[PDB]
Write a protein that binds this ligand. Structure first.
Ligand SMILES: NC(=O)c1cccc(NC(=O)/C=C/C(=O)O)c1
Length: 183
């Protein structure tokens, strides 16, 4: 299972396109979008769905999935397209992977670092946030001290008004779209 992938450009025409643009535009309408691409990685996608199938049947009425933003340098884009956000990724709440509710956070040059042509990249990612608590600065805390292998799926900065989520597990996030844009 080598998780090869294709990149398909999203046509302005595509219903999909407008949904990503709108959500991006809530907090980043001052940036100019060059393009939006869909990342098609069947092995990565299947393994993502496997964890979701598990997580749904486990968390009852909880909506496990959210769509969050993650900014990264150009160099990491191939890495992320193949391996999502699993383990071997160089790009005070955790040692997992951070994801932003609002594009503007991710659009910081420190995450969405401009390349030579001045182009910034932010993914719009399906993340399985599941059941979360407030996090502190490598594995999530345990839900129940009397049953402590049962863990929070993610942690967040504020539980009832969250602006970021941290994932620590494998196949917990799928990089469905990439948004390329400039200042
Ligand atoms: N990659 C992002 O878009 C993003 C979004 C929200 C938060 C962060 N990262 C952090 O706040 C801290 C990352 C780290 O300490 O490695 C990145």
């Amino acid at each position: 299972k080598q998780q090869n992938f294709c990149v398909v450009e999203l046509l302005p025409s595509d219903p999909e396109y407008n949904t990503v643009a709108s959500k991006f535009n809530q907090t980043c309408s001052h940036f100019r979008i060059e393009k939006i691409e869909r990342i098609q990685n069947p092995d990565l996608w299947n393994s993502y769905q496997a964890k979701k199938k598990t997580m749904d049947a486990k968390n009852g009425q909880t909506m496990n999935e959210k769509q969050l933003f993650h900014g990264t340098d150009a160099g990491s884009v191939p890495h992320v397209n193949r391996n999502g956000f699993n383990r071997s990724y160089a790009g005070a709440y955790g040692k997992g992977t951070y994801f932003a509710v609002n594009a503007n956070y991710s659009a910081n040059d420190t995450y969405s670092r401009p390349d030579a042509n001045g182009r910034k990249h932010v993914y719009y990612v399906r993340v399985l946030t599941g059941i979360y608590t407030h996090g502190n600065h490598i594995v999530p805390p345990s839900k129940n001290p009397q049953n402590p292998t049962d863990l929070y799926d993610t942690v967040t900065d504020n539980v009832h008004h969250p602006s970021l989520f941290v994932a620590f597990y494998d196949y917990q996030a799928y990089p469905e779209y990439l948004i390329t844009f400039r200042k």
